[PDB]
Design a protein around this nucleic acid. Sequence first.
RNA 1: CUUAAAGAGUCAACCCUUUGCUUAUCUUCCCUAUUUAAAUGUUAGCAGCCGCAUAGGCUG
Length: 302
Amino acid sequence: TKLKAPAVLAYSRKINPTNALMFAVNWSDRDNTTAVMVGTKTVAGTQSVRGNPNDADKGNIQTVNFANLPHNKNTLLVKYNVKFVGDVFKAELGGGEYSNTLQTALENTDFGTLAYRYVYNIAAGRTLWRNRVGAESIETVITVNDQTFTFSDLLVNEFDEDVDVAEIADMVAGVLSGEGFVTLKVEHYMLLGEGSEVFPSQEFVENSKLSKQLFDLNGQAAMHDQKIGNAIRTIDTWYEDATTPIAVEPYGSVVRNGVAYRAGNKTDLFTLMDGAVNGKSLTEEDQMFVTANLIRGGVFGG
RNA sequence: CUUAAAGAGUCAACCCUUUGCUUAUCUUCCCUAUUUAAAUGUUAGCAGCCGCAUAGGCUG
């Protein structure tokens, strides 16, 4: 007993998405993909900072980025490849006095549901935060091992039953429970309207710097890989007072709301893995949450 | 009323010169920095035109 957790214990990320490159298409002209360019407009304004009152007279020529659709294409296309990898129970930096006990404590994990919610967050449009808002038509095409799947009307908040997501979830759960990998090429086509302004992900700017950096690969608007990884693991409906699916965190913590849902109420990942290697009976939902964290990965040492 | 009581140490100056610390050196092998992640905080305070207004209203 009293199997104390290793200080070096970490797990690798098992859902690896690429950067979500963003293109402009039409709804019936889906093959002509023109890359959405981040424009950048200059704004003239004096600097106002707390530490330098002497520098407020002149300076701060700032040039803020923006990204709209072109005025001939009404559909935004978002392309990214989500790579699910198996052996989520292998610790990369941990070892096997604790990670092997985790293997033999989370073998009864229903990966079917875990994978369903992953592919449902892929398909329903959780990966399209501010640009699925106000779109009159949502479409998702998933290409997986030469199989094409079409999704039109999936409400993203609840994980309802559709056999299309389920079909992919099968091979995704077979990867995650076993050994190997699977790759889902996900292209989202959302009809926002003619010249509607799109929403790339944001680089962190300083309190000063410029107003807003949109995410650029080679000049073209895109969204962060870790931001999509936040979308995919947004499956946590099993904490106490669970209203909406949150991103599976080791503490159940969302930064933008200023509260942590699983911290400080004995449902955090660390107490559940210590309970697993000390062998108390877990329910299915918290064990699924622990396996979702191990799929997410991260260093758990102290 | 304290070995109480009391007291001017003054002055002057050439340290000189000289010098060979040289000699030769194998630092050297060895090797996992690894795994995560929403930037949120309304993230913008505009473009015309109605006017004498840098007063006050309207338009999207």
